[PDB]
Amino acid sequence: PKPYVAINMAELKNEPKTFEMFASVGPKVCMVTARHPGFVGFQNHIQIGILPFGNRYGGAKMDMTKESSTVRVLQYTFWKDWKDHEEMHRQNWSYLFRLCYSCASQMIWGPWEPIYEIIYANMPINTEMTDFTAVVGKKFAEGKPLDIPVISQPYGKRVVAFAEHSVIPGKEKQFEDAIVRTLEMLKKAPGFLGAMVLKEIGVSGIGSMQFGAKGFHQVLENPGSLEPDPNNVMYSVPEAKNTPQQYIVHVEWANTDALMFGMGRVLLYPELRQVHDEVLDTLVYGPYIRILNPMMEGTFWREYLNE
Amino acid sequence: PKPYVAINMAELKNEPKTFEMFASVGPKVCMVTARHPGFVGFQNHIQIGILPFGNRYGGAKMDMTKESSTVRVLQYTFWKDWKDHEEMHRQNWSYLFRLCYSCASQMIWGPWEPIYEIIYANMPINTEMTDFTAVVGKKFAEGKPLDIPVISQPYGKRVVAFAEHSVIPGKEKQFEDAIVRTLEMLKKAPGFLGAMVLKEIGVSGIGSMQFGAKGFHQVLENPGSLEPDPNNVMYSVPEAKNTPQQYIVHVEWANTDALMFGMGRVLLYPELRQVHDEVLDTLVYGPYIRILNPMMEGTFWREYLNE
Amino acid sequence: PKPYVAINMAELKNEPKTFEMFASVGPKVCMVTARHPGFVGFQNHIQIGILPFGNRYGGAKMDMTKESSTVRVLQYTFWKDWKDHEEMHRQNWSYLFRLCYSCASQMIWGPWEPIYEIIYANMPINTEMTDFTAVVGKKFAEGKPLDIPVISQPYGKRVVAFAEHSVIPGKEKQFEDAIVRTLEMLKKAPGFLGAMVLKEIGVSGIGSMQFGAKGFHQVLENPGSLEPDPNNVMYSVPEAKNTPQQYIVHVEWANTDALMFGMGRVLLYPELRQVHDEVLDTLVYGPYIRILNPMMEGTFWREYLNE
Amino acid sequence: PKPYVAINMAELKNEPKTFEMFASVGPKVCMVTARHPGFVGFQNHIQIGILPFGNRYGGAKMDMTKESSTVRVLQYTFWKDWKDHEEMHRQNWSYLFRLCYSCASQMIWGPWEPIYEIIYANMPINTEMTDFTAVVGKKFAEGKPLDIPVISQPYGKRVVAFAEHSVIPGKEKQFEDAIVRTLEMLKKAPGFLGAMVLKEIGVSGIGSMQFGAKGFHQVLENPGSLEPDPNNVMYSVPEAKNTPQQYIVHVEWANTDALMFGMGRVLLYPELRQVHDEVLDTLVYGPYIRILNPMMEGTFWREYLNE
Ligand SMILES: [Cl-]
Ligand SMILES: [Cl-]
Ligand SMILES: [Cl-]
Ligand SMILES: [Cl-]
Ligand SMILES: [Fe+3]
Ligand SMILES: [Fe+3]
Ligand SMILES: [Fe+3]
Ligand SMILES: [Fe+3]
Ligand SMILES: [Zn+2]
Ligand SMILES: [Zn+2]
Ligand SMILES: [Zn+2]
Ligand SMILES: [Zn+2]
């Protein structure tokens, strides 16, 4: 079934100490999150650059890692019910806060953790290049050659286009219909590894360290080993849902050239350009496309999705 | 009277070429904007850093200019009626688009131009250190010594705390009442040069280069000397107003230490801390405080404000 | 009214890591202390050098920062009642101990936190150079030009002479009478920014991490996240008051030259020299004068003082 | 009363030897000029750069001193009657010629010395920052707080905008009326230190070393110690007055940013822009704005002006 998705977003200093912290803290946070039976997996990204759209963002390029002073992370966690995410944070608060707070010395902005429903998904299981022979064998044995996926390699061996949009109130249905038509056509591009559309349903105050005054002071005053009051979050997830309505169109690609020219198909192929124009007409903001590297992940989230 | 404020926001590469184009393009855009009789002035900022709040943003500091790969600009233009801003962009589109588009090679994100109403203002005219003797003389001559302002020096000789907030729906009145009480007390801090509260009323699609499909293609395909269709903006300013409601609390200071400890008065002085806690209880997002340098400005906007 | 003063004293390694810790830990401690309604502010100092008194301390100079292997801090906190300080430490012990203990890797001596009553004060509110025009305007408007203070700039922009004395038992009244007469004359010196006389009333065992055996072992054995028993302090504040009676004469100055020659007025101006000789005749120890930089402060303590 | 102004203009090599000869010769010339009772003072400038007007003069900047191969000087001398200037040169010719001729090895162009009448003046006395307290005290004692000026610091501690204009024949009255209205509004800009409008009345042949054939040969053949015949000047001052009529608009500012944005007020503030447009409509040449540093001056010229 379709899980819900929480995306924890932050910006940190681009230096070795940050990546060192990622290496010790990140695995711990993942293991704590896996304590909850509603957890179905995760996919953690670092932003490597920005799609320049020709020279619309002429100061940007798809790989800015060697020049950037900051690193942006987008950590997706997948949940049977979005309420599971909220419960997980509260049940494991002593561990999670103290773990997450240890990133403090490196933080510039965040964390900010919106929650999304998946309104469209065409996403395969991941496989390594060693796996395909057995996958092919099994699918033919089962009489299901149509179920043989493209090879979508895990652990930093493919790239993601993360396309941000916000939509004019009243045009949500037009956007959703047109973006699905667009992605159904886009899947013909070489190196296409899948797509999904995430629709924001709210924001996790607890995941964003956004408390009332009491919790705010506890966070600012913290030596690192004392929890802020998790009950001091002043708003429910849906109370923070944005209008204009926000969407992420998440598309995965074999490599950055396939991404550039593949995403570009919505601009270069007349038939698809006409369809995609119906998406463009609905926007308040965007499209703004971040280029992400899915480095650390729990690939079994796609098994839940495709079961 | 209180003008409306449009704030054009963008992120560009932090390199000499960017600042060079600021120097040639910036003055031109300002002169074009001044063609409209509803224009009452401007105050252009570069972000120099971020308030770390102890080590809540421990990777940040108040002056990050020597290490940052990007520069963020926040250009305030002030208008008798916000409709004047929209009219100005459309009446002068050929010049403005071609001027603004010349920044393309340096752009990473933006432009994004929300529009604000000022719901509270305690902001003095600017004066240089050479002026105070005549100002004092004139105010005493007029029998109005209470109208003698602090010395708020123009053109990069003071600093701004730009504090971003979004508020839980239904708590807007509580936020507004508490922030005004907070700022009325905050004015006692040494080096305080004024404050105002900006409440978002919408976003300028034209100022944000956010068009329908037709205009988007025209932007992407532009050699630099052809206007997109300015009539192809698909939403009015108020249609893009955010919920949760966004506010900027803009506070000016003699220097970065006065800013750090002055803004800190809302955390360190028990009486003010209690009042400011009422603000904190209302938030979905924030406070996040950017440190800005008001470099290029048309100081006469404060003459309109205080007339 | 006159607050009481706790002065937390420590000596630490003079290296970047110490100043980095100051930057993250210091603000947190200040915010925790502000939790108590009897807290009226603070003034934190680093010692920059020692007054050489000609060549009496010929190895010393007013600014020894570039050569010294250690840095001494003197953190003043101001309290409506000295009992408020003791209550604050105990009410906020879990945060304060863990925060203060994080300074351990840098500590050479301390902390030691004597408590003082203020027996004489002539101390103005602080103002930045931008503020004076409004201050002058307001005072004249109120018909109180005599209430216009000198400009005492906050946040490291003036210097302090911290003059240590201990007095022969039985000569306390002579010392107190003579030092007040001295300071009343000293205020004529150029660049004089105020003075106060602090008389020790005791020592905070809890602030000095001075426990009985149980708490001592807990401190020595601490991983950093476990409180010693705050009830294991074996003496009350007044039980630790010193005899010979100790006093600090705290005098503020525009700059170090004004300090040197201004404090020197008590040696160089015959009329004042005769008065100051009455102070000198009472001493067991001193005068020993430390030169301090008041870097981080909550200036509103002077508002409480002068209200 | 308003004095007349002679402005001796020259261009010399930008090298130490030039500035060395400024230091020995300049004072001597000033002392000789002061022999005449009609001399009321002087204000000598070096051009430090050119106002680029955005990128209209994109090769220029306000401070070109580090890159320029030449230095332009503009030496103002002030006279009760312009005839006094002519008489002074002739009465002191042996000294002046031999002094002025010693600059020869450094000269590239000039000297050229037009004479001007002041048709508008709003110019304060100069004061150092040490003076303002006594000035304020005296003006209040006299009951004339409106006579307290801005602080216009002498000797290289402010900057001058030297704005060249020539006017269409028959439009002189329109120019003069509009420029006065403009300057009366301009005085509101922060850091404005005064303005005056100079109208050319002719050129001093003797000050410009412009003789008939006899004197020209004597100049060219001079060993440095023999006067050309001062009676060999072939034209009177008014005979050389230019048509189109030339004007200098001379505006003084606290610093180059105040100059740039202050002068810019005539382009950026719609109300002033409309008035200044009446000036622009009258021009044959200009505005061309030189940025000057008033280094060596006899400040008492402003005492004569304002008496
Ligand atoms: Cl797109
Ligand atoms: Cl805040
Ligand atoms: Cl002494
Ligand atoms: Cl001009
Ligand atoms: Fe989360
Ligand atoms: Fe705009
Ligand atoms: Fe203490
Ligand atoms: Fe002359
Ligand atoms: Zn798209
Ligand atoms: Zn706040
Ligand atoms: Zn003494
Ligand atoms: Zn002009």
GROMACS .gro file of C-alpha atoms in nm, chain A residues 77-182:
model
  106
   77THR     CA    1   1.090   0.813   0.653
   78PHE     CA    2   0.795   0.601   0.545
   79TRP     CA    3   0.499   0.513   0.769
   80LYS     CA    4   0.189   0.292   0.747
   81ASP     CA    5  -0.010   0.580   0.901
   82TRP     CA    6   0.132   0.932   0.949
   83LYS     CA    7   0.023   0.909   1.312
   84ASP     CA    8   0.285   0.634   1.354
   85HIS     CA    9   0.556   0.894   1.289
   86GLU     CA   10   0.421   1.121   1.561
   87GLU     CA   11   0.391   0.831   1.803
   88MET     CA   12   0.745   0.712   1.724
   89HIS     CA   13   0.894   1.053   1.807
   90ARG     CA   14   0.708   1.066   2.140
   91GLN     CA   15   0.775   0.704   2.241
   92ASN     CA   16   1.147   0.739   2.170
   93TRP     CA   17   1.192   1.103   2.261
   94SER     CA   18   1.478   1.066   2.513
   95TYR     CA   19   1.692   0.885   2.254
   96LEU     CA   20   1.586   1.087   1.949
   97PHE     CA   21   1.616   1.433   2.097
   98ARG     CA   22   1.961   1.363   2.241
   99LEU     CA   23   2.075   1.204   1.916
  100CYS     CA   24   1.930   1.477   1.694
  101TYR     CA   25   2.053   1.751   1.923
  102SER     CA   26   2.412   1.627   1.885
  103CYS     CA   27   2.405   1.767   1.528
  104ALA     CA   28   2.377   2.118   1.675
  105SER     CA   29   2.735   2.234   1.622
  106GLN     CA   30   2.689   2.182   1.247
  107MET     CA   31   2.338   2.320   1.195
  108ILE     CA   32   2.256   2.636   0.996
  109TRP     CA   33   1.881   2.591   0.939
  110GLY     CA   34   1.622   2.330   1.039
  111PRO     CA   35   1.514   2.077   1.118
  112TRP     CA   36   1.181   2.121   0.941
  113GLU     CA   37   0.973   1.807   0.887
  114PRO     CA   38   0.663   1.828   0.666
  115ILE     CA   39   0.445   1.518   0.627
  116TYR     CA   40   0.309   1.402   0.289
  117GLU     CA   41   0.056   1.165   0.144
  118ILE     CA   42   0.156   0.987  -0.175
  119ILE     CA   43  -0.109   1.056  -0.440
  120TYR     CA   44   0.073   0.879  -0.724
  121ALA     CA   45   0.352   0.623  -0.726
  122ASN     CA   46   0.540   0.435  -0.997
  123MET     CA   47   0.844   0.322  -0.799
  124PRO     CA   48   1.026  -0.013  -0.836
  125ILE     CA   49   1.210  -0.217  -0.577
  126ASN     CA   50   1.582  -0.139  -0.576
  127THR     CA   51   1.826  -0.398  -0.705
  128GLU     CA   52   2.203  -0.414  -0.734
  129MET     CA   53   2.354  -0.504  -1.071
  130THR     CA   54   2.427  -0.849  -0.923
  131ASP     CA   55   2.059  -0.919  -0.867
  132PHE     CA   56   1.902  -0.889  -1.211
  133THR     CA   57   1.967  -1.246  -1.331
  134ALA     CA   58   1.774  -1.395  -1.037
  135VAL     CA   59   1.498  -1.136  -1.067
  136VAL     CA   60   1.452  -1.214  -1.434
  137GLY     CA   61   1.460  -1.588  -1.363
  138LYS     CA   62   1.197  -1.563  -1.091
  139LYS     CA   63   0.961  -1.338  -1.289
  140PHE     CA   64   0.968  -1.565  -1.593
  141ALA     CA   65   0.920  -1.870  -1.369
  142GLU     CA   66   0.609  -1.703  -1.228
  143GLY     CA   67   0.480  -1.610  -1.574
  144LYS     CA   68   0.512  -1.237  -1.497
  145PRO     CA   69   0.778  -1.089  -1.730
  146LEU     CA   70   0.590  -0.757  -1.716
  147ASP     CA   71   0.686  -0.738  -1.347
  148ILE     CA   72   1.057  -0.722  -1.428
  149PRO     CA   73   1.168  -0.375  -1.318
  150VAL     CA   74   1.441  -0.146  -1.444
  151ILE     CA   75   1.760  -0.174  -1.239
  152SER     CA   76   1.739   0.096  -0.972
  153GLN     CA   77   2.063   0.068  -0.776
  154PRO     CA   78   2.059   0.150  -0.405
  155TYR     CA   79   2.307   0.339  -0.188
  156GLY     CA   80   2.419   0.642  -0.386
  157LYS     CA   81   2.420   0.473  -0.728
  158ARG     CA   82   2.143   0.674  -0.893
  159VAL     CA   83   2.012   1.030  -0.865
  160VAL     CA   84   1.684   1.200  -0.774
  161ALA     CA   85   1.509   1.506  -0.918
  162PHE     CA   86   1.321   1.672  -0.628
  163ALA     CA   87   1.080   1.915  -0.792
  164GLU     CA   88   0.909   2.162  -0.559
  165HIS     CA   89   0.571   2.315  -0.650
  166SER     CA   90   0.301   2.516  -0.480
  167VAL     CA   91  -0.039   2.547  -0.647
  168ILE     CA   92  -0.297   2.824  -0.684
  169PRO     CA   93  -0.592   2.759  -0.448
  170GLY     CA   94  -0.867   2.590  -0.649
  171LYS     CA   95  -0.628   2.445  -0.909
  172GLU     CA   96  -0.521   2.142  -0.701
  173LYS     CA   97  -0.730   1.898  -0.908
  174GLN     CA   98  -0.594   2.037  -1.237
  175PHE     CA   99  -0.237   2.007  -1.106
  176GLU     CA  100  -0.288   1.651  -0.983
  177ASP     CA  101  -0.455   1.531  -1.302
  178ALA     CA  102  -0.193   1.694  -1.527
  179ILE     CA  103   0.108   1.584  -1.326
  180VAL     CA  104  -0.008   1.221  -1.334
  181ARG     CA  105  -0.056   1.240  -1.714
  182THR     CA  106   0.290   1.398  -1.739
   0.00000   0.00000   0.00000
